[PDB]
Amino acid sequence: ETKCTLKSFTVEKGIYQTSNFRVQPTESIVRFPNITNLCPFGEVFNATRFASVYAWNRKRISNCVADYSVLYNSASFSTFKCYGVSPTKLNDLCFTNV
Amino acid sequence: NGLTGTGVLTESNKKFLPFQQFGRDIADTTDAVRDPQTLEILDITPCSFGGVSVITPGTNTSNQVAVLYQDVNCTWRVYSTGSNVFQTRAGCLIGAEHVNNSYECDIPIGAGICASYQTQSIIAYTMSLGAENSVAYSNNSIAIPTNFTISVTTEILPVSMTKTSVDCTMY
Amino acid sequence: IIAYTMSLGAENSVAYSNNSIAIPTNFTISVTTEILPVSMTKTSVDCTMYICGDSTECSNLLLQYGSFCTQLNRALTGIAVEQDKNTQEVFAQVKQIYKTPPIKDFGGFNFSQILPDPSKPSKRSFIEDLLFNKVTLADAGFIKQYGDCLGDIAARDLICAQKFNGLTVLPPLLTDEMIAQYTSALLAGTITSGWTFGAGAALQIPFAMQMAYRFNGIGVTQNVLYENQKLIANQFNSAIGKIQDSLSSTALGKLQDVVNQNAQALNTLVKQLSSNFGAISSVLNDILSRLDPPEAEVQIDRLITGRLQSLQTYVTQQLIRAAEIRASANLAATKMSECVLGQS
Amino acid sequence: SSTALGKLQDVVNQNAQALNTLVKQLSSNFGAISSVLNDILSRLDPPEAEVQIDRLITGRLQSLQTYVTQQLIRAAEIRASANLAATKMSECVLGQSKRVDFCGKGYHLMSFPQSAPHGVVFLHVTYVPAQEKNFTTAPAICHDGKAHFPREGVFVSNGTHWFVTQRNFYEPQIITTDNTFVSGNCDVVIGIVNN
Amino acid sequence: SSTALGKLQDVVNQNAQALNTLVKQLSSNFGAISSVLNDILSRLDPP
Ligand SMILES: *[C@@H]1O[C@H](CO)[C@@H](O[C@@H]2O[C@H](CO)[C@@H](O)[C@H](O)[C@H]2NC(C)=O)[C@H](O)[C@H]1NC(C)=O
Ligand SMILES: *[C@@H]1O[C@H](CO)[C@@H](O[C@@H]2O[C@H](CO)[C@@H](O)[C@H](O)[C@H]2NC(C)=O)[C@H](O)[C@H]1NC(C)=O
Ligand SMILES: *[C@@H]1O[C@H](CO)[C@@H](O[C@@H]2O[C@H](CO)[C@@H](O)[C@H](O)[C@H]2NC(C)=O)[C@H](O)[C@H]1NC(C)=O
Ligand SMILES: *[C@@H]1O[C@H](CO)[C@@H](O[C@@H]2O[C@H](CO)[C@@H](O)[C@H](O)[C@H]2NC(C)=O)[C@H](O)[C@H]1NC(C)=O
Ligand SMILES: *[C@@H]1O[C@H](CO)[C@@H](O[C@@H]2O[C@H](CO)[C@@H](O)[C@H](O)[C@H]2NC(C)=O)[C@H](O)[C@H]1NC(C)=O
Ligand SMILES: *[C@@H]1O[C@H](CO)[C@@H](O)[C@H](O)[C@H]1NC(C)=O
Ligand SMILES: *[C@@H]1O[C@H](CO)[C@@H](O)[C@H](O)[C@H]1NC(C)=O
Ligand SMILES: *[C@@H]1O[C@H](CO)[C@@H](O)[C@H](O)[C@H]1NC(C)=O
Ligand SMILES: *[C@@H]1O[C@H](CO)[C@@H](O)[C@H](O)[C@H]1NC(C)=O
Ligand SMILES: *[C@@H]1O[C@H](CO)[C@@H](O)[C@H](O)[C@H]1NC(C)=O
Ligand SMILES: *[C@@H]1O[C@H](CO)[C@@H](O)[C@H](O)[C@H]1NC(C)=O
Ligand SMILES: *[C@@H]1O[C@H](CO)[C@@H](O)[C@H](O)[C@H]1NC(C)=O
Ligand SMILES: *[C@@H]1O[C@H](CO)[C@@H](O)[C@H](O)[C@H]1NC(C)=O
């Protein structure tokens, strides 16, 4: 460590500070709430009548697992863009006030 | 709940209001969390802690070293245990043999303790302040010199350093 | 609340004439104190632990700024060894540990409040003990174990908050008992040998005759001392008693300001970890989760730049303060050689 | 000629190390895609190469700033050292100093300057007493109900006879009325002796 | 009364020059589109 922080192969007599004592993690744990249902993917994206844009509709979503892969067979979106989050991270997260 | 991290989880005494899930310290790092299944509060403490120093007699003489863990008290969070474990008010020193003598400081460990490459091995000792002396003081005794010596000593003092200039655009 | 013009001092007039003189007929022996800072706290910083923590992505991104951390630590180690050099120039002037004999016959002068107390664990004087309790440090020892602050004890104890972020305080080379031994040797030499132990070998001399020499040095004949010896001894003893009194009563502000400044600097470093520096958050774990590598790197870069400049500011101000303490320690060494080892 | 001037070599070493550190710090990206301006300016067009060049400019400017600041601090220290050397030149070389340990250990006699690379060396010639000897002493001498004090010396006794000598060199002499002066009678001085 | 106190005038000169340099350094873009906050805040929206 000292040879490498000195950028030399020779060390001269003395005492040198090295990095703090590190401990490596042994396990990995995940703790999500107890949720069983799936989110209403089929009554939001597969509804029969949508609202007019001047009187748009707002729906509350809560207490459901957001496994969007079920939309892969029956849906094809021409525009999909998220702001404030990455699309590749959506499967690890947990969402508030949806 | 999506918040990732690393550390040690322990049972807590903090008590959250029902609308709270995370707890933050002054540096704004998350240091407490409510478990989403058991609804119990946990403290999150970092994992790395404690300074480390390495004492070498120079790698042009030997690759023996001693290691000072400045935050350990052995009577462990160490890389190795070997032999010659010696406790100091500066930390736990591993790899150097403790002796009872006292010399001038060679490599200062700290808190009054020095180390040196003697007999080869590495030894650690308490530094000596100097030779002890006593003056034969009485209320009617004086000491007068009878000879002298002419002494010549050197004293070195820096007076200048190198004058440099820099071209910003070129750098 | 009142506002006024400050006064410069009491007005006085000298009765000057072309054939008038004023001659003293008595004297007073005065004892005064002078306080001088000699060292400050030696600190060290782990860049990786301060800037990144246990983040591996941040630590890999930081490898473009390793020269800057080697530079910071070089500066801090320079300061750290300079502090020990300071203490050595001030206190280690003589390398013979003189003891004072059990012959406490010093012509009537009482040196009991400034001479070592063998009834203590240390061998500190009475005055040194009174001084030791008027300066409150921040580190009672230098071994704070990991298990000792594990839980919420961290971030409620400022020292564990500093330690979990890579900020270490190293212990001085000379313990307080060694410094007390040095001052004890200086006192013993100066009261049993006068000013001769600073120029060669200590040559004993009775204390009253040494005091007569010192009276000669200021332009007063020796018979003035020898004929007023009891009065002079009593005045000296009373003045020393006045010192202890005043102290034990009520300060060492110039020595407490150093401790306060170092502690405040470290704590300011710790609180500056709550700045966004123009990023979306100040926590690496909120960025690394909810953002993917290539577009989290911009935020992590902002944080890295901010925290690096924070460390740089700290090191610069520490260098400036160390220069000032160096000047003070040089003055103290000069005063030790010229006022204690001689007569000025 | 045997075997050093460490305090004068440290200055050279520090300045050289500072300049070389400046040179190696040109290999930092500072958060850009590369540390070479020619890899950015080729493969990238002006408006979107300007962001990278801005990152590099900021980094290198702060590198220069750090260098200049540390140079100023070091120059202050060298200024203090040079002021001390000028004081020593005027007070130890151009005169004789009474300040203890200012111009060497002992009693200062004289000093000689020698020039060295980026510095000065002083050779301090001092006087060190040696071969001391024990004597009995007294503050005053009582002769005719009068107390006699030495003029510029101290009263010593070889065991049987009393002499007056100078304080820094043993040179005993007979106590006369030209060595001493009278003040008062023999009732106030504490350790007065008869002679 | 004839003809100086250069060492005392250099202090005044240095302090004045430092303050004036601070004032002129308000004309730097630092890599932005302009050095005026009112040209940025007008023609550009918050985020
Ligand atoms: C979440 O589910 C777990 C089980 O999957 C529940 O844990 C039970 O808790 C009760 C306490 O009232 C225990 O008696 C059971 O033994 C637990 N079950 C298991 C398998 O450990 C938990 O209660 C659920 N969450 C909530 C809020 O009810
Ligand atoms: C004072 O000390 C000097 C030594 O510094 C003595 O001179 C030495 O005497 C010895 C023995 O006679 C010789 O071997 C040396 O050559 C002498 N030294 C020099 C430099 O000449 C001197 O005798 C001492 N004087 C007294 C009175 O003791
Ligand atoms: C020395 O003699 C002078 C001359 O009388 C004294 O000083 C004057 O004192 C009066 C009253 O205190 C003042 O009003 C005058 O202004 C003083 N100065 C003069 C008259 O020039 C002084 O008190 C004497 N000093 C001592 C020690 O006795
Ligand atoms: C010189 O001053 C001292 C005081 O410092 C005088 O001694 C005091 O005398 C008074 C009255 O006799 C006593 O109450 C005090 O106890 C004495 N002080 C001490 C410390 O002993 C002394 O008389 C003065 N001398 C002259 C010639 O005026
Ligand atoms: C103290 O010194 C005196 C010198 O004055 C010694 O006395 C003389 O010694 C010499 C040689 O022994 C004799 O010739 C003289 O007759 C002595 N007397 C005088 C008046 O000169 C004396 O011996 C010394 N004492 C000690 C203890 O060394
Ligand atoms: C939507 O309708 C299609 C076709 O009928 C079907 O495949 C799909 O399962 C429906 N979605 C839901 C959520 O039921
Ligand atoms: C250390 O090694 C170098 C090269 O091998 C050599 O020149 C040098 O003299 C060695 N050190 C000592 C103290 O001999
Ligand atoms: C080590 O622990 C002992 C007792 O547990 C304690 O006395 C000592 O102070 C500790 N180490 C140091 C040098 O502080
Ligand atoms: C070293 O000092 C200790 C202190 O108790 C003593 O017990 C021992 O005999 C001495 N010699 C050794 C152990 O080398
Ligand atoms: C010196 O003064 C102290 C008071 O602090 C007293 O205890 C002691 O007895 C005095 N010494 C002598 C010899 O009177
Ligand atoms: C002075 O006398 C004392 C008392 O015996 C002794 O310790 C010491 O050696 C003597 N000093 C010299 C220089 O003879
Ligand atoms: C010196 O002390 C002795 C005690 O041995 C005493 O008899 C004598 O009177 C004292 N003399 C002086 C001048 O203090
Ligand atoms: C000194 O001489 C006087 C007068 O001759 C005498 O009274 C006194 O006692 C003597 N002192 C001693 C100590 O003999």
Curated annotation (Swiss-Prot), chain B:
- Statement on biotechnological application from the UniProt entry: Main component of the anti-COVID vaccine Chadox1/AZD1222/AstraZeneca; in which the human tPA leader sequence is added in N-terminus to enhance protein secretion.
The effect of T119A is: Partial loss of O-glycosylation by host GALNT1
Q: What is the effect of changing D71G?
A: Increase of pseudotyped VSV particle production ex vivo. Increase of viral load in hamster upper respiratory tract
Q: How is it modified after translation?
A: The cytoplasmic Cys-rich domain is palmitoylated. Palmitoylated spike proteins drive the formation of localized ordered cholesterol and sphingo-lipid-rich lipid nanodomains in the early Golgi, where viral budding occurs. Specific enzymatic cleavages in vivo yield mature proteins. The precursor is processed into S1 and S2 by host furin or unknown proteases to yield the mature S1 and S2 proteins. Processing between S2 and S2' occurs either by host CTSL in endosomes, or by host TMPRSS2 at the cell surface. Both cleavages are necessary for the protein to be fusion competent. Cell surface activation allows the virus to enter the cell despite inhibition of the endosomal pathway by hydroxychloroquine. The polybasic furin cleavage site is absent in SARS-CoV S.
What's the impact of mutating Q70H? In strain: A23.1
Which residue positions carry a glycan here? N60, N73, N100, T119, N139, N147
Disulphide bonds annotated for this chain are: C74-C92, C105-C114
Give its localization.
Virion membrane; Host endoplasmic reticulum-Golgi intermediate compartment membrane; Host cell membrane
What family is this? Answer: Belongs to the betacoronaviruses spike protein family.
Comment, domains? Contains sequence and structural motifs very similar to those of a bacterial superantigen and can directly bind and activate T-cell receptors. Activation of a broad T-cell repertoire may be involved in the hyperinflammatory syndrome in acute COVID disease. The KxHxx motif seems to function as an ER retrieval and binds COPI in vitro.
- Tell me what this protein is called: Spike glycoprotein
